[PDB]
Each structure stands twice: as structure tokens, then as C-alpha cells.
Amino acid sequence: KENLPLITLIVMMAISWGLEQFNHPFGQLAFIATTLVGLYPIARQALRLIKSGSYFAIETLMSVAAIGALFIGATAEAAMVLLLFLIGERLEGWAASRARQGVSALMALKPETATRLRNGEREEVAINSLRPGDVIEVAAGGRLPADGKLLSPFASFDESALTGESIPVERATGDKVPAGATSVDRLVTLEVLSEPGASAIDRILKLIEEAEERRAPIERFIDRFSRIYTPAIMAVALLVTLVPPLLFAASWQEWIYKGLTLLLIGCPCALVISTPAAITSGLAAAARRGALIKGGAALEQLGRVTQVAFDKTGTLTVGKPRVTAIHPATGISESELLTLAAAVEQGATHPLAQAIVREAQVAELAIPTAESQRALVGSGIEAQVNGERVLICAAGKHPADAFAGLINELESAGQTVVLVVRNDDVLGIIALQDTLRADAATAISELNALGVKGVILTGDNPRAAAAIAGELGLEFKAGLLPEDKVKAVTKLNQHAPLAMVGDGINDAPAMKAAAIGIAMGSGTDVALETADAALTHNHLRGLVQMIELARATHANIRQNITIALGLKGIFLVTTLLGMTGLWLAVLADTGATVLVTANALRLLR
Numbered sequence: 001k002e003n004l005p006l007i008t009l010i011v012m013m014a015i016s017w018g019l020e021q022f023n024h025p026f027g028q029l030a031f032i033a034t035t036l037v038g039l040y041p042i043a044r045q046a047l048r049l050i051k052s053g054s055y056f057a058i059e060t061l062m063s064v065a066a067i068g069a070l071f072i073g074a075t076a077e078a079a080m081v082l083l084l085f086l087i088g089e090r091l092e093g094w095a096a097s098r099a100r101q102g103v104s105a106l107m108a109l110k111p112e113t114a115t116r117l118r119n120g121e122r123e124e125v126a127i128n129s130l131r132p133g134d135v136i137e138v139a140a141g142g143r144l145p146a147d148g149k150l151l152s153p154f155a156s157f158d159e160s161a162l163t164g165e166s167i168p169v170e171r172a173t174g175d176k177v178p179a180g181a182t183s184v185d186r187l188v189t190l191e192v193l194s195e196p197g198a199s200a201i202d203r204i205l206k207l208i209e210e211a212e213e214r215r216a217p218i219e220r221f222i223d224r225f226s227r228i229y230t231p232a233i234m235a236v237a238l239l240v241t242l243v244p245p246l247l248f249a250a251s252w253q254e255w256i257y258k259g260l261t262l263l264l265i266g267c268p269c270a271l272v273i274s275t276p277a278a279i280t281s282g283l284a285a286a287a288r289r290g291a292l293i294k295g296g297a298a299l300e301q302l303g304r305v306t307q308v309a310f311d312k313t314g315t316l317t318v319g320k321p322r323v324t325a326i327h328p329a330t331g332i333s334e335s336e337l338l339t340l341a342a343a344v345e346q347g348a349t350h351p352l353a354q355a356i357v358r359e360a361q362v363a364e365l366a367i368p369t370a371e372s373q374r375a376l377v378g379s380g381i382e383a384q385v386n387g388e389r390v391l392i393c394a395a396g397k398h399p400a401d402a403f404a405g406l407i408n409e410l411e412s413a414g415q416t417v418v419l420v421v422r423n424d425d426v427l428g429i430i431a432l433q434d435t436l437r438a439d440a441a442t443a444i445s446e447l448n449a450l451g452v453k454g455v456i457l458t459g460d461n462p463r464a465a466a467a468i469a470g471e472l473g474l475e476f477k478a479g480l481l482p483e484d485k486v487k488a489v490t491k492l493n494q495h496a497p498l499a500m501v502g503d504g505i506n507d508a509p510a511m512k513a514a515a516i517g518i519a520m521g522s523g524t525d526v527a528l529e530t531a532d533a534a535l536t537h538n539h540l541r542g543l544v545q546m547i548e549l550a551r552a553t554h555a556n557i558r559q560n561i562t563i564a565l566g567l568k569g570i571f572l573v574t575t576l577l578g579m580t581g582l583w584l585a586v587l588a589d590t591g592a593t594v595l596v597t598a599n600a601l602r603l604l605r
């Protein structure tokens, strides 16, 4: 396992070193060879970047530096820096490879396939074999394979992955429901409207790669560094070659040699080793505490952002409801109302019913009875408790005058209220609301400690938006389509680099449109794909720990650099001012490089 192409380079360089201690002048041919063969992929890309307007990219630096000493005597030296580079590179590529498929693990792979109901019989067609007008069946807990027109009486859906809606949607006959997610209770039958590559998920899908066909290429810390440093030394090196003969009358010879020498010594094995070291270290260190950043080029951008755009449903929150308020009619206790509700709601899979039953249990309430359980009527379920017909239904699906005002109150506060009704009397009302992640609050505060302002970008209604945003200290923009998240995000990213965090599909377009997109581990597949980094665990405090780590990495890079090239500086002069000598004499670089290894490890903790 599994690639030996580099392995040859390590061994050619070993064979060279060896047969020079005896049989000297084939040892130098050996190096010429190994230097050249290391140089071929480097010198070649350099030329490619060159042709595409990008010169002074490094591979430029070491192509020129190698080609320099390539014949002035110093082969092993140039061979060595060339060698170290393509190693550290392979290291970093091997970290990004792990990080990517590590994310690829979270992908809970789509199964595809639909169940088309034709001549009274069901067949398992392939999704793409669907035509509009086709009648399709979707079973409870199953996502839609296409945009469908609801054919069945009543049905409720979890289309939070698309719209960011916090609560299931109660749709009726002839209503439109988009592809991808999700019948929550009840087996539904739809009629296909979407044509293959044209479902709601597809329409969102092109916005992603469209926002991609708009992305700025990524200048790395080092391509951007050598963009300055490379022509710097190249310009001086040339001039240290030219000046002495011109004035002085001195052997172009001894200054050709000195010039090219300075050029090469301007590229030690370190520094070239610097940027991969910190990246390999950072990515790994960042992965330790739960955060999988893909490419190290992404990690770089991470230590550069100062803004965050969260979405709420699923990422700031949990996308599961909890009981927030119990309000009984007069002559009843919260506990009776709640237990009577739970009696009907036991069994039911609807997220709301679950939230209710949870409530009864947490409060040490023995739930009873159950007899009928008739999930019909229209957004209401009704069962038979204690001999009576008990109805639990949604908001305005039954008159509740005595409760009207209070209902409004709750509703304006971003709360969703269900009514409990025996005979034809609202025995009382219950208010529920989506729940925010535990570490959310603290996390936000922590981000502020780092000077990172946050906003909420959600497709959910502005009341739920206001509620959650209110618990935190954040601004928000609500009811907004994926395009609007993109628009808002690109509007922000102007000022300062922004990190976008999202769960569902509607965030993915906004994700490729801003510095970095981070997907929740509970994220949708397309979100996990589009994400530049993923949070396993779904811990929001990872974000802080991300940015922190990220910035350290940025610092760490430029430390390695200034030690690497830096001590190449000093011995430079020591060996050239009559010292001449000491330890460091020739050896005092490999003394850098190792510190560049070591300093890069001040990243773990």
C-alpha cells in the first residue's frame, strides 16, 4: 500500500550518497540523475503555471534554484531540497485525502428508486423512469424522489432540508411538495410534476456549481509568499553576478558561480518543508477535536475569517420540537392536559406528538389507555380515551375563542400550538418550539471573544427566526430562499472573509459563495459534499476551536519560514566572515528543517 513512485527517489538518492564514498565520479552522475528525476514533475508544473500567467510560483523558485546548482557542483544539495519538497507535499496531500473521505463517511448514501403505482400494482422503477402524471407512493419516513402534487386527503412533511422550516408542514389535496424529504407520518400518494433533471433538488443544485463558476482561485500562503520572495532573491542573485565584473573587473566566472550559489542557498530544504508541515499538523490537530477540514488550502482560509453566517434549523438548532407551554382550560391542571394529550400521541411518529410524550415522561406522568387512534380529520389525530373522543389538532383547525388571544401571543413568539378538545370543548392548548443545540449559546459567546460577529440566514418563518435569534444575541434574515442566502453571503464576504455554517441543501449554494462552508455532521449529503469542512459530533464549539486552530496554523507557517530561511541567513554570514567555521558551518541548516518539523508540532494539545 500503495504508491512507490516517490520511493524510488529516496532510494536513488541513497544509492548516490553511497557510491560516492568510493567510485566518486559516478556518485556525481548518480546525483545528476536523482536530481533530474526529482525535478521533472516540479520543473514541469512550474512551466504550466508559467504559461497560465502565473510565474514566480515557487516550483519557479526551486526549478531555477535546482537548475542553478544542477551543475555548479552542488547536486545532492539541490537534490535534497527538491526531494524534501515533493515529500512534504505528499504528506499534506495524504492528510487532505483522509480528511475528505472521513467526511465521505458521514454521507448516509442515497438509495435512489421510487415506487410507481400504475395499473393498481406497484413497481420499483428507477427515479429517472418517472414522467409527470405518474402516480407515486411514498411511505412514512421516506423522502420524495420528485416534486409531487399531493393526491391523498391530508399529509404532513419534513421539508426542513429544503426550506429550513422548523416544523412539519400540513399539506392538503393538490398541494405541491418538493423532491427530497419527507413524509413524517402516513403513507402518502403523490402525482409526479417534476421531470428528471428538473426537481427542486436539481434547481437548487445548479446554484451550487453556478456559485462555483464564480469562485476566486485560491492563492496559497506560499505561492503568495514566493510571489514576492522569489523575484526578490532572483533579482539580487543576478545583480551579485553582474556588478563585480562591470566595476572591479572581476571574473564573470567567480561571480556567475557566486550568483547561482546565492540563488540556491536562498532555497533551503526547510521553508520548502515549512508550509506542508504546519498544514499536515493543523489539519490533523483540527481533526482531533472533531472538525474535519478538507484540503489544507481550506484550512489556510479558515485562519482568515472574522464573520460567521449560521443557518438555524438543524445547525443552530436540532430540528426537533420540545414543549414550551402548557395552558389548561379552567378546572384542569397542566398535568391532566398533558397526560391526556400523551395518551393520544403515543405511537404517533410526528415530531410534535413525540415532543408531547417526552414531556409527559420527563414529568413522571403515567400515560394511560389508548384504544382507536385515528390519524385522520386534517392535521389532527384523535383517539378514544376514558370512553371519550379526544382530538389533538393544529392551530386554527378548531374554534378556540377563549384561548384565541393567548394562542396569538404564543404564535407571535415563534411558538406552534396544538389544541386538546374533548367533545367539542377545547380542554386546553400546548405550545411547542424547535430546540437549539446545547453548546450553541456558549459557542456564540466564545466566537465573540475572538471578535467574530454572527448572523442568522434562515429560510424559516421570521417568528421562529426571531425566537431563536432572540435567545442568542444575533441578528437574522428570515424566510429567504437559497439564492437569498447566496446574495446575503456574497454581500457580506465583501467586507471580511465569512464562514458559512449549514445543515441542509439550501445552504450549499451559500456555502461555495464564501471563504469556507462548514457542514453539520447531521448535514444533508449535498451539504457535506459542498462543505469545505465538516463538523462531526454536531458540536458548535468546534467552530471556535476551528478558527483558533486555524489561526495558529497561519502563525505556525510563518514561524517555520522565518526559522528555516532565517538561520540559513545567519550561518550564511558566519561561514562567510571568517567562520570558517563551526557547527552550522555546513550542517547548520538541517538544523533548521528539524526545528521546522518541531515548531509545526506546537499545534497539538
Ligand code: BEF
Binding pocket: 160, 161, 162, 163, 164, 165, 311, 312, 313, 314, 315, 457, 458, 459, 460, 503, 504, 505, 506, 507
Ligand atoms: F435549516 Be435551514 F434554515 F435550511
Ligand SMILES: [Mg+2]
Binding pocket: 160, 161, 164, 311, 312, 313, 314, 315, 502, 503, 504
Ligand atoms: Mg437546515
